[PDB]
Amino acid sequence: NPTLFVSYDQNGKKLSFANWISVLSPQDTPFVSMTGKESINQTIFSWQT
Amino acid sequence: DALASVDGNNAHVEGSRAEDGEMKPTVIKSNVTQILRKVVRVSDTANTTANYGRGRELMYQLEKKGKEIKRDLEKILLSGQARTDVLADQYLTNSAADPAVAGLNDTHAARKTGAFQFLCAHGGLAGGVVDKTKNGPADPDTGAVTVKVAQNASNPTTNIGFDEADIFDMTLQLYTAGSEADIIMINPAHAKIFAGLQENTQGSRKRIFENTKQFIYEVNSITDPLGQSYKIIVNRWMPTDAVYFFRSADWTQMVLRAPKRTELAKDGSYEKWMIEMEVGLRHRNPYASGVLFTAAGK
Amino acid sequence: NYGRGRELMYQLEKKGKEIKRDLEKILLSGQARTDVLADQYLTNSAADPAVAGLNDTHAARKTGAFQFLCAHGGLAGGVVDKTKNGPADPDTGAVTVKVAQNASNPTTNIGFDEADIFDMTLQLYTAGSEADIIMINPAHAKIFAGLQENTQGSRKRIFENTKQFIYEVNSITDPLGQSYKIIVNRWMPTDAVYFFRSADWTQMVLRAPKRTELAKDGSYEKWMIEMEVGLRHRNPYASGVLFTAAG
């Protein structure tokens, strides 16, 4: 029941909900982008040198 | 919000059950607005005359004030005030109200917005302004520090500037966090630094001239070792104690009450007017822009 | 309620990206090959007699990272050692795993070498390696820009009445004619430098990442993501690793 209307005496204060969320975590992954993928069928693979 | 830094070396067995992960919530930011005002008062007599190089004393004085308010705005948004306000921990106000300061009146203090420095990764405060003698914290996920106190160890104590190498250190911090800053706003008094990249103790991209009739001595574009191309901009209303690394899209001006016409009472040969507008400032992420303070050398 | 719609799909996307972030970090971390099997390929007798019976009490597995698959020359526990130089190639006289001597840049700062880097390109040239890339953490990219013109003296990098500033080096030419290409990696460790070639490394995929809803048994609404992959390296001496050590 404020006599002098101000912002600090209002029982309302309907908050302003922004329509976005900020994120900066990058996912460049330069190595994984240049390696190449080869499908296998065993948990262990071997090669000779 | 930001992803988790639990990357580590997660290794799981083949025949186990899904164990509960590590979930972290978001983080809410909040900034208050500030009230700008410019008053006008001119006696009816002076407003009735016809000046020798203009019209009425009212509109002319109003236009002069309508421009000063914009200058005051540009200087405040770029200031380092600490968002002076009386409220505290009352933004998620859903379970109850705040009657602590409800039995008050215009005696309330003056509200202030969170300027460029306060919205960034500030390390501390100085009562009402951000403290430049403290190095800001680091992001939880990344390890970037967008608030770095220049060392200036390269340059002597005679000239102050901020540094020549500390400019490249911020680009590293921004890239480390993932920011897309591409602008470097600077005070005109410090432009001699970005142009005067010399005085590096005989090294580091010093200088040369091919005896030409053109002398420029200016640096507008910059590229860092990582590839981030930056463009230097000068702002007359910027302070001379810090440099800003930011992006236009990562900032917005929150306007609540726009400037409008306000005719007030007279009380006798006063013809009083007033200008007023409430505006705030926003920042998508404190770690999306850099602030390079200035300090002496060795 | 208002404002806060859902947190299920949002969290799935977050996890969908985190799993990839970990992969780029694990392959370049330097962990050690972990497994419960050993020398079970030439006995021509059976897979393993002594490991059978344990259903899920087994220990986790680890993939040979960039360092393990190279001529590391010793381990410091669960991760490759960053101090002991790799073993010299028996055929050639090459050593692809070295340690920065830190001649200049006194011990006041860690100071990754910034010099004698052409030695590694020599070790590679001596080993027939076709390395053409130098993956490095951005925390040490300035050392390559200073390689342009610092030389602790008068080399006089020039302006030529220009306003554009570059001070960036991304390509180098070895004295032996080997032209390399510098690349920045945010997930690389701040104490290593990888000289290699892309074609010499393959990604062995066994279980591609896939979402699978699990049982509820209440209001849990449990979800998970899982992927099984490995790393391959044609020849250890086909790539090099240069650590950083002050003193």
Residue numbers in the entry:
A (entry chain W): 3 to 51
B (entry chain K): 52 to 349
C (entry chain W): 102 to 348
What text does the study give?
Escherichia coli phage SU10 belongs to the genus Kuravirus from the class Caudoviricetes of phages with short non-contractile tails. Here we show that the virion of SU10 has a prolate head, containing genome and ejection proteins, and a tail, which is formed of portal, adaptor, nozzle, and tail needle proteins and decorated with long and short fibers. In contrast to other short-tailed phages, the tails of Kuraviruses elongate upon cell attachment. After binding to the host, SU10 tail, nozzle proteins, and short fibers re-arrange to form a nozzle that extends the tail.
The central tubular part of the capsid is built from 90 hexamers arranged in nine layers of a ten-entry helix. The hexamers in the caps are more bent (H4, H5; 149-150°), whereas those that form the tubular part of the capsid are relatively flat (H1, H2L, H2R, H3; 154–164°). All hexamer-hexamer and hexamer-pentamer interfaces in the caps are arched (145°), however, the hexamers that form the tubular part of the capsid are connected by two types of interfaces, arched (145°) and more planar (160°). The arched interfaces enable the formation of rings of hexamers, whereas the more planar ones mediate interactions between the rings. In hexamers, the annular loop protrudes away from the axial domain. The six annular loops from subunits forming one hexamer form a ring around its quasi-sixfold axis. Nine shells of density can be distinguished inside the tubular part of the head, whereas only four shells are resolved underneath the capsid caps. In both five-fold symmetric and asymmetric reconstructions of the SU10 head, the DNA strands in the two outermost layers are organized as ten-entry helices.
